[PDB]
Amino acid sequence: FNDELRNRREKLAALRQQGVAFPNDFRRDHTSDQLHEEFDAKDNQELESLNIEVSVAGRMMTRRIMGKASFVTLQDVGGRIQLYVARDSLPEGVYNDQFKKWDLGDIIGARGTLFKTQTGELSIHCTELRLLTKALRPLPDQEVRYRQRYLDLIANDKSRQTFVVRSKILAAIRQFMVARGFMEVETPMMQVIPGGASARPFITHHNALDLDMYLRIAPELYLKRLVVGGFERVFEINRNFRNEGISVRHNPEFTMMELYMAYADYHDLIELTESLFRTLAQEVLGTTKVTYGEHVFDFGKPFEKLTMREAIKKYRPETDMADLDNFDAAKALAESIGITVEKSWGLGRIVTEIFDEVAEAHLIQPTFITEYPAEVSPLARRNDVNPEITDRFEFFIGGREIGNGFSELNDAEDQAERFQEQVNAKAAGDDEAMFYDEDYVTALEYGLPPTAGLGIGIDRMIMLFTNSHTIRDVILFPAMRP
Amino acid sequence: FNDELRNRREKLAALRQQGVAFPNDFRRDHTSDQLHEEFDAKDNQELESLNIEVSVAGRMMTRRIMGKASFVTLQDVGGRIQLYVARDSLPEGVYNDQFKKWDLGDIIGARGTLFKTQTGELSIHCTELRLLTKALRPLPDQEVRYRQRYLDLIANDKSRQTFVVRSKILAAIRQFMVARGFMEVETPMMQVIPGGASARPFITHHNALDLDMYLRIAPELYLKRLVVGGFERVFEINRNFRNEGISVRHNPEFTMMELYMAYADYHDLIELTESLFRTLAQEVLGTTKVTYGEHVFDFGKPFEKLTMREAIKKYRPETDMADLDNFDAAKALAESIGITVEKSWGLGRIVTEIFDEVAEAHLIQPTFITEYPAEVSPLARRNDVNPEITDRFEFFIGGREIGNGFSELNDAEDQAERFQEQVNAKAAGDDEAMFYDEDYVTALEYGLPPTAGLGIGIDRMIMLFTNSHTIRDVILFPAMRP
């Protein structure tokens, strides 16, 4: 390696000495993939009768010099194409004085006619060949992939495919959404008062205003302000920020999508979610059957629906449901399971925590859990029959929470009361409790039509579609400890 | 007003007493825009036969009661539709005991048959009408539009359209880019070391790692690592954050687009830009002629190209160009014009400052200024013939900068040199200087193909297409000092 670096650096020095070492005038007219799709099925005789002269450019990955002729493999955006480099085809001295002196990793440009070798390999009989960029380091533990993605992308075909599929999926979500009358929007990333979820925010200071501002933990309250203003079908895909452990299954910043449609309840959201996945699986993967890890989910089949209580009873059948109707009982129950009950918690929270311990990890196949207690749903419409629970649902796949949506609370007086409770909880030590957003209440006071909103964790979604098992395998540049 | 509030708040109470004040079961099947586009050209004879029963829902903007019959104007996403509310057509008592007690601002849902009034107005003869959300505040100085956008959106057709067009423009940019082979990507918003531009970053603290991290001032350095990795045509549209205090058309966070294409120089970018604008204008607006303020920009015609020096000499013709070739002379020149020459500045910076004073504001029609000095272009390829200037260009429209682009620097050693210059300068007081990114240099050592990159200020672009003259008119929730 140390010898490799010196060698390459000496070679660069020679280049500088004779002119331009870093030229930018070479132009290519094809990527390997195009050449492949169009010519991989044509007979050598056919290709020979058509002097299809192309020019490509990319990174020299392999080379086999057999005196007077060499076979090189070039890699560009689309993949690899094979070059046939022969002394007598290139200009005088190029093959010996230049080509043979180049290193693997070097970026080169080539021009020549297409043909096929006796194997069925599409190749380019080079007539012009030139060095565009000298690589000073040799072509390339699990941390390196994340700390230097560019290396990962060069080596790993699978790593590339994952990120390409990522872009395909995002493009498909926007198209799905737009086809249904939704309009994409951009709401503030820096907020005076954070909200829309329960999490520890990042804080940054604006100097000009001397104002402390928070990085968005959710765009919810702003999106809903647009529904009051008339944008009745609105959605947004962008980042949220949260102060938590880097976890190796977490990242301080991640991509979320939120959507709100007026004149709709959560039931409409359940259908939309099912259609979204079925469609994405169908379009991007070709199947509604998605093999993830040691599992096969079927997205072309309606998902399971269980109320939170059904889920608890199902995964801990010895549970006396009566215990969940009384604070003291639920508390003691919670503690027996090993749940440390904080002082700010009420019955609904204790019940939810019990749910998280007991049932969450067993929710492998796509499941919707419904009827969340009011206490843990500050922004969700109360159920008409039982106002102690809200018309909210969460959505799980592979034992992890993928989505969260609900019939929105458009009762300003109730919203205000719910925010007050949040403040009291914050005073009592719940530092994830929400802030009282006075302006949001005011917006509701002008009138929010009955609405349903849904949030979906996009990174998590991308994991399922690429069989990636860490959130870090699906984010180009994950957070690390430099 | 204070009476309207108590008045309205009392009605809600009434509603609560008797059932559900906030129902969410009503479903509409049309928006005003749909009904207009399909039935605005059907004579009442045709409409009557085709008993088209539609259900709509929206905000009650106006009401003219005339005993036993009233006219109401409903406003939803699509626009406004007229309702014909008559006692005899509605269920027993609705008109007198309900309809007449509703207030302007309430969200209502209605169902009835289409017909045209004696004026050519498309209207709905309601047979069912009901209250969905009570507005506890009456329907709605310049600051308010910004601090309470929902009010602005409810009231201004122009504001609504501005934001509708913005979404169309962004959607068109992505389509334009995807058609040309680009892949949209997502790079970090929080970074360990900011770069890609000269500006004051925001700082925030990640507690778990104890790291202070910076809000992205530009995605540049990360996007170029993707090109090294093989993603030869990437682009990204998302926010950048800067502590330029701000007023007028400055916001602490704004939307930038950056694109990188391998095997290209800035000339290719100049073409891409012209096509980008010609197309957006052509599609979003319908013409290549865009009226903006008191000006008319013709985007179907090639933009002006001027070197930086030509521009200076052109708008201050009395200038002795030789002064720009000498540090003392240039400094002196700068001072005459009223430019305070900072200590860290060198000739290139001084000359650039002079351009900004003299030339910048006179660049009204689309203009490309080229040949920027190396001192102010840390990341751009030096020109072959004159290594003191770089193959860089900036793009102006309406006297403001819309884009910045250049043939990328892929000479690692040069890159390191320039980061050093930048560091020396930060030491000498230039707090907008860049940080030395060691990983970036390394990435370059692996090999960056000759590349061309371009950054375009999306917000600025939207102003031009919507005849908005502040950046705040084009940003849904602009930052305000509380």
Side-chain angles (χ1 to χ4, degrees), chain A residues 28 59 136-137 186-187 203-204 239 253 381 411 445-446, chain B residues 16 22 59 136-137 187 190 203-204 232 239 255 445 447:
Chain A
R28 64 169 177 192
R59 177 167 262 125
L136 294 178
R137 298 191 168 225
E186 289 170 89
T187 57
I203 308 179
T204 184
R239 261 155 274 181
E253 66 176 283
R381 187 168 121 77
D411 180 343
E445 292 189 347
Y446 278 97
Chain B
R16 290 194 192 274
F22 303 90
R59 172 169 269 118
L136 291 179
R137 289 186 182 227
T187 56
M190 289 180 74
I203 304 179
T204 187
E232 301 170 314
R239 257 150 277 176
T255 306
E445 285 173 356

PDB file of all heavy atoms in Angstrom, chain A residues 28 59 136-137 186-187 203-204 239 253 381 411 445-446, chain B residues 16 22 59 136-137 187 190 203-204 232 239 255 445 447:
ATOM      1  N   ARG A  28     -18.340  11.408 -23.401  1.00  0.00           N
ATOM      2  CA  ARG A  28     -18.805  10.051 -23.688  1.00  0.00           C
ATOM      3  C   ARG A  28     -20.229  10.148 -24.213  1.00  0.00           C
ATOM      4  O   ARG A  28     -20.952  11.081 -23.863  1.00  0.00           O
ATOM      5  CB  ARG A  28     -18.792   9.194 -22.417  1.00  0.00           C
ATOM      6  CG  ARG A  28     -19.756   9.659 -21.327  1.00  0.00           C
ATOM      7  CD  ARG A  28     -19.891   8.623 -20.211  1.00  0.00           C
ATOM      8  NE  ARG A  28     -20.759   9.069 -19.126  1.00  0.00           N
ATOM      9  CZ  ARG A  28     -20.866   8.461 -17.948  1.00  0.00           C
ATOM     10  NH1 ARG A  28     -20.162   7.371 -17.690  1.00  0.00           N
ATOM     11  NH2 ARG A  28     -21.684   8.945 -17.025  1.00  0.00           N
ATOM     12  N   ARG A  59     -14.302   4.010 -14.584  1.00  0.00           N
ATOM     13  CA  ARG A  59     -13.172   3.588 -13.777  1.00  0.00           C
ATOM     14  C   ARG A  59     -12.632   2.238 -14.219  1.00  0.00           C
ATOM     15  O   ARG A  59     -13.401   1.301 -14.442  1.00  0.00           O
ATOM     16  CB  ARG A  59     -13.608   3.558 -12.317  1.00  0.00           C
ATOM     17  CG  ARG A  59     -12.581   3.082 -11.365  1.00  0.00           C
ATOM     18  CD  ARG A  59     -13.031   3.410  -9.977  1.00  0.00           C
ATOM     19  NE  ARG A  59     -12.413   4.634  -9.488  1.00  0.00           N
ATOM     20  CZ  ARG A  59     -13.095   5.672  -9.033  1.00  0.00           C
ATOM     21  NH1 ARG A  59     -14.417   5.653  -9.055  1.00  0.00           N
ATOM     22  NH2 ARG A  59     -12.460   6.708  -8.515  1.00  0.00           N
ATOM     23  N   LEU A 136      -4.815   8.209  -6.909  1.00  0.00           N
ATOM     24  CA  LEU A 136      -3.625   8.196  -6.071  1.00  0.00           C
ATOM     25  C   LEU A 136      -3.659   7.093  -5.022  1.00  0.00           C
ATOM     26  O   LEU A 136      -2.650   6.823  -4.371  1.00  0.00           O
ATOM     27  CB  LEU A 136      -3.431   9.556  -5.391  1.00  0.00           C
ATOM     28  CG  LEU A 136      -3.115  10.742  -6.304  1.00  0.00           C
ATOM     29  CD1 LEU A 136      -3.013  12.019  -5.493  1.00  0.00           C
ATOM     30  CD2 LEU A 136      -1.825  10.490  -7.057  1.00  0.00           C
ATOM     31  N   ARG A 137      -4.823   6.485  -4.833  1.00  0.00           N
ATOM     32  CA  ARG A 137      -4.979   5.394  -3.884  1.00  0.00           C
ATOM     33  C   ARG A 137      -5.572   4.177  -4.570  1.00  0.00           C
ATOM     34  O   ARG A 137      -6.404   4.300  -5.464  1.00  0.00           O
ATOM     35  CB  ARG A 137      -5.868   5.820  -2.736  1.00  0.00           C
ATOM     36  CG  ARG A 137      -5.277   6.947  -1.971  1.00  0.00           C
ATOM     37  CD  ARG A 137      -6.009   7.189  -0.697  1.00  0.00           C
ATOM     38  NE  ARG A 137      -5.222   8.097   0.110  1.00  0.00           N
ATOM     39  CZ  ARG A 137      -4.986   7.934   1.404  1.00  0.00           C
ATOM     40  NH1 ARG A 137      -5.489   6.889   2.054  1.00  0.00           N
ATOM     41  NH2 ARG A 137      -4.228   8.812   2.044  1.00  0.00           N
ATOM     42  N   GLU A 186     -43.467  22.393   1.615  1.00  0.00           N
ATOM     43  CA  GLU A 186     -42.259  22.555   2.405  1.00  0.00           C
ATOM     44  C   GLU A 186     -42.572  23.417   3.614  1.00  0.00           C
ATOM     45  O   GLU A 186     -42.956  24.577   3.463  1.00  0.00           O
ATOM     46  CB  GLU A 186     -41.165  23.205   1.570  1.00  0.00           C
ATOM     47  CG  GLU A 186     -40.610  22.296   0.503  1.00  0.00           C
ATOM     48  CD  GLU A 186     -39.711  23.021  -0.476  1.00  0.00           C
ATOM     49  OE1 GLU A 186     -38.491  23.112  -0.219  1.00  0.00           O
ATOM     50  OE2 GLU A 186     -40.239  23.499  -1.506  1.00  0.00           O
ATOM     51  N   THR A 187     -42.474  22.830   4.801  1.00  0.00           N
ATOM     52  CA  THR A 187     -42.745  23.544   6.046  1.00  0.00           C
ATOM     53  C   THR A 187     -41.403  23.725   6.746  1.00  0.00           C
ATOM     54  O   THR A 187     -40.477  22.980   6.485  1.00  0.00           O
ATOM     55  CB  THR A 187     -43.756  22.772   6.916  1.00  0.00           C
ATOM     56  OG1 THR A 187     -43.269  21.449   7.176  1.00  0.00           O
ATOM     57  CG2 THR A 187     -45.090  22.671   6.196  1.00  0.00           C
ATOM     58  N   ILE A 203     -31.287  21.929  19.668  1.00  0.00           N
ATOM     59  CA  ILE A 203     -31.481  23.367  19.779  1.00  0.00           C
ATOM     60  C   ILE A 203     -30.302  24.052  19.145  1.00  0.00           C
ATOM     61  O   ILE A 203     -29.167  23.586  19.258  1.00  0.00           O
ATOM     62  CB  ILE A 203     -31.542  23.839  21.225  1.00  0.00           C
ATOM     63  CG1 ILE A 203     -32.559  23.016  22.006  1.00  0.00           C
ATOM     64  CG2 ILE A 203     -31.946  25.299  21.263  1.00  0.00           C
ATOM     65  CD1 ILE A 203     -32.655  23.402  23.472  1.00  0.00           C
ATOM     66  N   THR A 204     -30.576  25.162  18.485  1.00  0.00           N
ATOM     67  CA  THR A 204     -29.536  25.936  17.846  1.00  0.00           C
ATOM     68  C   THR A 204     -29.898  27.381  18.071  1.00  0.00           C
ATOM     69  O   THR A 204     -31.067  27.708  18.286  1.00  0.00           O
ATOM     70  CB  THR A 204     -29.456  25.645  16.351  1.00  0.00           C
ATOM     71  OG1 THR A 204     -28.358  26.370  15.797  1.00  0.00           O
ATOM     72  CG2 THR A 204     -30.730  26.062  15.647  1.00  0.00           C
ATOM     73  N   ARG A 239     -36.795  15.540   6.297  1.00  0.00           N
ATOM     74  CA  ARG A 239     -36.197  15.089   7.529  1.00  0.00           C
ATOM     75  C   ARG A 239     -36.771  15.601   8.832  1.00  0.00           C
ATOM     76  O   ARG A 239     -37.326  16.687   8.883  1.00  0.00           O
ATOM     77  CB  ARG A 239     -34.692  15.321   7.466  1.00  0.00           C
ATOM     78  CG  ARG A 239     -33.985  14.045   7.095  1.00  0.00           C
ATOM     79  CD  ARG A 239     -32.681  14.289   6.446  1.00  0.00           C
ATOM     80  NE  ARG A 239     -32.808  14.477   5.010  1.00  0.00           N
ATOM     81  CZ  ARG A 239     -31.763  14.693   4.223  1.00  0.00           C
ATOM     82  NH1 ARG A 239     -30.553  14.728   4.756  1.00  0.00           N
ATOM     83  NH2 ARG A 239     -31.915  14.917   2.925  1.00  0.00           N
ATOM     84  N   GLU A 253     -31.016  12.072  12.472  1.00  0.00           N
ATOM     85  CA  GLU A 253     -31.874  12.608  11.427  1.00  0.00           C
ATOM     86  C   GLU A 253     -32.378  11.516  10.486  1.00  0.00           C
ATOM     87  O   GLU A 253     -31.609  10.670  10.029  1.00  0.00           O
ATOM     88  CB  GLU A 253     -31.156  13.712  10.649  1.00  0.00           C
ATOM     89  CG  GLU A 253     -29.950  13.278   9.835  1.00  0.00           C
ATOM     90  CD  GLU A 253     -29.362  14.421   9.011  1.00  0.00           C
ATOM     91  OE1 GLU A 253     -29.953  14.764   7.966  1.00  0.00           O
ATOM     92  OE2 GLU A 253     -28.304  14.970   9.397  1.00  0.00           O
ATOM     93  N   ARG A 381     -58.374  12.911  17.479  1.00  0.00           N
ATOM     94  CA  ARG A 381     -59.790  13.025  17.771  1.00  0.00           C
ATOM     95  C   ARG A 381     -60.223  11.953  18.765  1.00  0.00           C
ATOM     96  O   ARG A 381     -59.773  10.812  18.689  1.00  0.00           O
ATOM     97  CB  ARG A 381     -60.586  12.899  16.472  1.00  0.00           C
ATOM     98  CG  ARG A 381     -62.061  13.174  16.624  1.00  0.00           C
ATOM     99  CD  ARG A 381     -62.737  13.333  15.283  1.00  0.00           C
ATOM    100  NE  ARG A 381     -63.792  12.345  15.128  1.00  0.00           N
ATOM    101  CZ  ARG A 381     -64.985  12.431  15.700  1.00  0.00           C
ATOM    102  NH1 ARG A 381     -65.309  13.487  16.425  1.00  0.00           N
ATOM    103  NH2 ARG A 381     -65.836  11.427  15.609  1.00  0.00           N
ATOM    104  N   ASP A 411     -60.930  20.255  17.604  1.00  0.00           N
ATOM    105  CA  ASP A 411     -61.626  20.884  18.710  1.00  0.00           C
ATOM    106  C   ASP A 411     -60.566  21.703  19.455  1.00  0.00           C
ATOM    107  O   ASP A 411     -59.756  21.148  20.205  1.00  0.00           O
ATOM    108  CB  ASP A 411     -62.197  19.790  19.614  1.00  0.00           C
ATOM    109  CG  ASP A 411     -62.955  20.331  20.801  1.00  0.00           C
ATOM    110  OD1 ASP A 411     -62.808  21.524  21.140  1.00  0.00           O
ATOM    111  OD2 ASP A 411     -63.703  19.545  21.416  1.00  0.00           O
ATOM    112  N   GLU A 445     -58.969  27.541  16.074  1.00  0.00           N
ATOM    113  CA  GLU A 445     -60.103  28.406  16.379  1.00  0.00           C
ATOM    114  C   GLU A 445     -60.723  29.043  15.145  1.00  0.00           C
ATOM    115  O   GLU A 445     -61.883  29.454  15.177  1.00  0.00           O
ATOM    116  CB  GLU A 445     -59.713  29.472  17.404  1.00  0.00           C
ATOM    117  CG  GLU A 445     -59.432  28.891  18.791  1.00  0.00           C
ATOM    118  CD  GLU A 445     -59.263  29.939  19.875  1.00  0.00           C
ATOM    119  OE1 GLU A 445     -59.115  31.136  19.553  1.00  0.00           O
ATOM    120  OE2 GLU A 445     -59.271  29.561  21.063  1.00  0.00           O
ATOM    121  N   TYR A 446     -59.954  29.137  14.066  1.00  0.00           N
ATOM    122  CA  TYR A 446     -60.475  29.637  12.793  1.00  0.00           C
ATOM    123  C   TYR A 446     -61.197  28.536  12.036  1.00  0.00           C
ATOM    124  O   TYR A 446     -61.931  28.806  11.079  1.00  0.00           O
ATOM    125  CB  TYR A 446     -59.366  30.226  11.926  1.00  0.00           C
ATOM    126  CG  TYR A 446     -59.007  31.644  12.300  1.00  0.00           C
ATOM    127  CD1 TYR A 446     -57.924  31.915  13.125  1.00  0.00           C
ATOM    128  CD2 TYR A 446     -59.768  32.713  11.840  1.00  0.00           C
ATOM    129  CE1 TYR A 446     -57.610  33.220  13.486  1.00  0.00           C
ATOM    130  CE2 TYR A 446     -59.464  34.013  12.193  1.00  0.00           C
ATOM    131  CZ  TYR A 446     -58.387  34.265  13.015  1.00  0.00           C
ATOM    132  OH  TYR A 446     -58.085  35.565  13.357  1.00  0.00           O
TER     133      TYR A 446
ATOM    134  N   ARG B  16     -72.493  21.207  21.307  1.00  0.00           N
ATOM    135  CA  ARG B  16     -71.972  20.158  22.169  1.00  0.00           C
ATOM    136  C   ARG B  16     -73.084  19.521  22.987  1.00  0.00           C
ATOM    137  O   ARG B  16     -73.143  18.304  23.141  1.00  0.00           O
ATOM    138  CB  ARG B  16     -70.940  20.719  23.132  1.00  0.00           C
ATOM    139  CG  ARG B  16     -69.658  21.146  22.505  1.00  0.00           C
ATOM    140  CD  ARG B  16     -68.643  21.345  23.599  1.00  0.00           C
ATOM    141  NE  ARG B  16     -67.446  22.019  23.126  1.00  0.00           N
ATOM    142  CZ  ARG B  16     -66.410  21.396  22.581  1.00  0.00           C
ATOM    143  NH1 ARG B  16     -66.426  20.078  22.426  1.00  0.00           N
ATOM    144  NH2 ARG B  16     -65.351  22.091  22.202  1.00  0.00           N
ATOM    145  N   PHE B  22     -68.352  18.018  16.464  1.00  0.00           N
ATOM    146  CA  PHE B  22     -67.292  17.804  15.478  1.00  0.00           C
ATOM    147  C   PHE B  22     -67.401  16.468  14.723  1.00  0.00           C
ATOM    148  O   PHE B  22     -66.565  15.573  14.883  1.00  0.00           O
ATOM    149  CB  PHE B  22     -65.923  17.915  16.162  1.00  0.00           C
ATOM    150  CG  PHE B  22     -65.698  19.225  16.873  1.00  0.00           C
ATOM    151  CD1 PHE B  22     -66.062  19.379  18.206  1.00  0.00           C
ATOM    152  CD2 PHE B  22     -65.102  20.299  16.219  1.00  0.00           C
ATOM    153  CE1 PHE B  22     -65.834  20.577  18.878  1.00  0.00           C
ATOM    154  CE2 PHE B  22     -64.869  21.508  16.884  1.00  0.00           C
ATOM    155  CZ  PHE B  22     -65.236  21.644  18.216  1.00  0.00           C
ATOM    156  N   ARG B  59     -65.498  25.913   3.151  1.00  0.00           N
ATOM    157  CA  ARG B  59     -65.732  27.045   4.034  1.00  0.00           C
ATOM    158  C   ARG B  59     -66.738  28.051   3.466  1.00  0.00           C
ATOM    159  O   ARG B  59     -66.642  28.456   2.305  1.00  0.00           O
ATOM    160  CB  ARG B  59     -64.396  27.716   4.345  1.00  0.00           C
ATOM    161  CG  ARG B  59     -64.501  29.010   5.080  1.00  0.00           C
ATOM    162  CD  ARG B  59     -63.140  29.430   5.565  1.00  0.00           C
ATOM    163  NE  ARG B  59     -62.865  28.927   6.909  1.00  0.00           N
ATOM    164  CZ  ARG B  59     -61.875  28.096   7.205  1.00  0.00           C
ATOM    165  NH1 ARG B  59     -61.089  27.626   6.244  1.00  0.00           N
ATOM    166  NH2 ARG B  59     -61.638  27.784   8.467  1.00  0.00           N
ATOM    167  N   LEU B 136     -64.671  29.499  15.480  1.00  0.00           N
ATOM    168  CA  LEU B 136     -64.804  30.288  16.693  1.00  0.00           C
ATOM    169  C   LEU B 136     -64.263  31.699  16.512  1.00  0.00           C
ATOM    170  O   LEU B 136     -64.197  32.471  17.473  1.00  0.00           O
ATOM    171  CB  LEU B 136     -64.088  29.602  17.851  1.00  0.00           C
ATOM    172  CG  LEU B 136     -64.723  28.305  18.351  1.00  0.00           C
ATOM    173  CD1 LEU B 136     -63.906  27.723  19.491  1.00  0.00           C
ATOM    174  CD2 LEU B 136     -66.131  28.571  18.804  1.00  0.00           C
ATOM    175  N   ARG B 137     -63.824  32.012  15.294  1.00  0.00           N
ATOM    176  CA  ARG B 137     -63.348  33.351  14.945  1.00  0.00           C
ATOM    177  C   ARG B 137     -63.813  33.747  13.554  1.00  0.00           C
ATOM    178  O   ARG B 137     -63.826  32.928  12.634  1.00  0.00           O
ATOM    179  CB  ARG B 137     -61.836  33.434  15.029  1.00  0.00           C
ATOM    180  CG  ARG B 137     -61.357  33.383  16.438  1.00  0.00           C
ATOM    181  CD  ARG B 137     -59.884  33.595  16.534  1.00  0.00           C
ATOM    182  NE  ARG B 137     -59.479  33.490  17.926  1.00  0.00           N
ATOM    183  CZ  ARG B 137     -58.676  34.348  18.537  1.00  0.00           C
ATOM    184  NH1 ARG B 137     -58.194  35.397  17.884  1.00  0.00           N
ATOM    185  NH2 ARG B 137     -58.350  34.152  19.805  1.00  0.00           N
ATOM    186  N   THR B 187     -28.456  13.751   1.140  1.00  0.00           N
ATOM    187  CA  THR B 187     -27.212  13.803   1.887  1.00  0.00           C
ATOM    188  C   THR B 187     -27.492  14.500   3.226  1.00  0.00           C
ATOM    189  O   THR B 187     -28.460  15.241   3.344  1.00  0.00           O
ATOM    190  CB  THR B 187     -26.148  14.544   1.080  1.00  0.00           C
ATOM    191  OG1 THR B 187     -26.638  15.844   0.746  1.00  0.00           O
ATOM    192  CG2 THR B 187     -25.851  13.791  -0.204  1.00  0.00           C
ATOM    193  N   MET B 190     -27.217  17.577   9.014  1.00  0.00           N
ATOM    194  CA  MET B 190     -26.353  17.906  10.144  1.00  0.00           C
ATOM    195  C   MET B 190     -25.005  17.321   9.779  1.00  0.00           C
ATOM    196  O   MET B 190     -24.929  16.165   9.364  1.00  0.00           O
ATOM    197  CB  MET B 190     -26.851  17.247  11.426  1.00  0.00           C
ATOM    198  CG  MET B 190     -28.131  17.821  11.989  1.00  0.00           C
ATOM    199  SD  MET B 190     -28.603  16.943  13.488  1.00  0.00           S
ATOM    200  CE  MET B 190     -27.434  17.592  14.620  1.00  0.00           C
ATOM    201  N   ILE B 203     -24.992  26.049  14.843  1.00  0.00           N
ATOM    202  CA  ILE B 203     -24.391  24.968  15.608  1.00  0.00           C
ATOM    203  C   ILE B 203     -25.436  24.415  16.554  1.00  0.00           C
ATOM    204  O   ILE B 203     -26.244  25.161  17.116  1.00  0.00           O
ATOM    205  CB  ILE B 203     -23.198  25.450  16.445  1.00  0.00           C
ATOM    206  CG1 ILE B 203     -22.165  26.114  15.550  1.00  0.00           C
ATOM    207  CG2 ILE B 203     -22.540  24.282  17.145  1.00  0.00           C
ATOM    208  CD1 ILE B 203     -20.968  26.625  16.303  1.00  0.00           C
ATOM    209  N   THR B 204     -25.418  23.102  16.719  1.00  0.00           N
ATOM    210  CA  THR B 204     -26.325  22.434  17.629  1.00  0.00           C
ATOM    211  C   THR B 204     -25.530  21.306  18.259  1.00  0.00           C
ATOM    212  O   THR B 204     -24.491  20.907  17.737  1.00  0.00           O
ATOM    213  CB  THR B 204     -27.549  21.893  16.890  1.00  0.00           C
ATOM    214  OG1 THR B 204     -28.494  21.387  17.841  1.00  0.00           O
ATOM    215  CG2 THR B 204     -27.151  20.787  15.931  1.00  0.00           C
ATOM    216  N   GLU B 232     -22.697   9.025 -11.167  1.00  0.00           N
ATOM    217  CA  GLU B 232     -22.231  10.076 -12.058  1.00  0.00           C
ATOM    218  C   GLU B 232     -23.194  11.212 -12.409  1.00  0.00           C
ATOM    219  O   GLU B 232     -22.754  12.259 -12.886  1.00  0.00           O
ATOM    220  CB  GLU B 232     -21.641   9.442 -13.326  1.00  0.00           C
ATOM    221  CG  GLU B 232     -20.475   8.488 -13.029  1.00  0.00           C
ATOM    222  CD  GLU B 232     -20.021   7.672 -14.233  1.00  0.00           C
ATOM    223  OE1 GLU B 232     -20.884   7.113 -14.944  1.00  0.00           O
ATOM    224  OE2 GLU B 232     -18.792   7.569 -14.449  1.00  0.00           O
ATOM    225  N   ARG B 239     -33.145  22.009   1.808  1.00  0.00           N
ATOM    226  CA  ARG B 239     -32.737  23.223   2.479  1.00  0.00           C
ATOM    227  C   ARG B 239     -31.289  23.398   2.858  1.00  0.00           C
ATOM    228  O   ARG B 239     -30.572  22.433   3.092  1.00  0.00           O
ATOM    229  CB  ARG B 239     -33.619  23.444   3.688  1.00  0.00           C
ATOM    230  CG  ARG B 239     -34.635  24.493   3.400  1.00  0.00           C
ATOM    231  CD  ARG B 239     -35.888  24.277   4.165  1.00  0.00           C
ATOM    232  NE  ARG B 239     -36.787  23.325   3.538  1.00  0.00           N
ATOM    233  CZ  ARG B 239     -37.918  22.945   4.113  1.00  0.00           C
ATOM    234  NH1 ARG B 239     -38.230  23.440   5.301  1.00  0.00           N
ATOM    235  NH2 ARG B 239     -38.736  22.090   3.518  1.00  0.00           N
ATOM    236  N   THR B 255     -34.380  26.787   0.148  1.00  0.00           N
ATOM    237  CA  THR B 255     -34.251  25.626  -0.718  1.00  0.00           C
ATOM    238  C   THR B 255     -33.265  25.817  -1.859  1.00  0.00           C
ATOM    239  O   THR B 255     -33.445  26.706  -2.695  1.00  0.00           O
ATOM    240  CB  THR B 255     -35.606  25.295  -1.316  1.00  0.00           C
ATOM    241  OG1 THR B 255     -36.554  25.150  -0.252  1.00  0.00           O
ATOM    242  CG2 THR B 255     -35.547  24.022  -2.138  1.00  0.00           C
ATOM    243  N   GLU B 445      -8.536  11.693  -3.610  1.00  0.00           N
ATOM    244  CA  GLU B 445      -7.382  10.846  -3.891  1.00  0.00           C
ATOM    245  C   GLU B 445      -7.797   9.511  -4.487  1.00  0.00           C
ATOM    246  O   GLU B 445      -6.998   8.858  -5.155  1.00  0.00           O
ATOM    247  CB  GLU B 445      -6.530  10.636  -2.644  1.00  0.00           C
ATOM    248  CG  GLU B 445      -5.695  11.846  -2.281  1.00  0.00           C
ATOM    249  CD  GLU B 445      -4.976  11.705  -0.957  1.00  0.00           C
ATOM    250  OE1 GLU B 445      -5.168  10.696  -0.261  1.00  0.00           O
ATOM    251  OE2 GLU B 445      -4.218  12.620  -0.595  1.00  0.00           O
ATOM    252  N   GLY B 447     -10.200   9.354  -6.665  1.00  0.00           N
ATOM    253  CA  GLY B 447     -10.471   9.689  -8.053  1.00  0.00           C
ATOM    254  C   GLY B 447     -11.854  10.218  -8.371  1.00  0.00           C
ATOM    255  O   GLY B 447     -12.830   9.476  -8.365  1.00  0.00           O
TER     256      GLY B 447
END
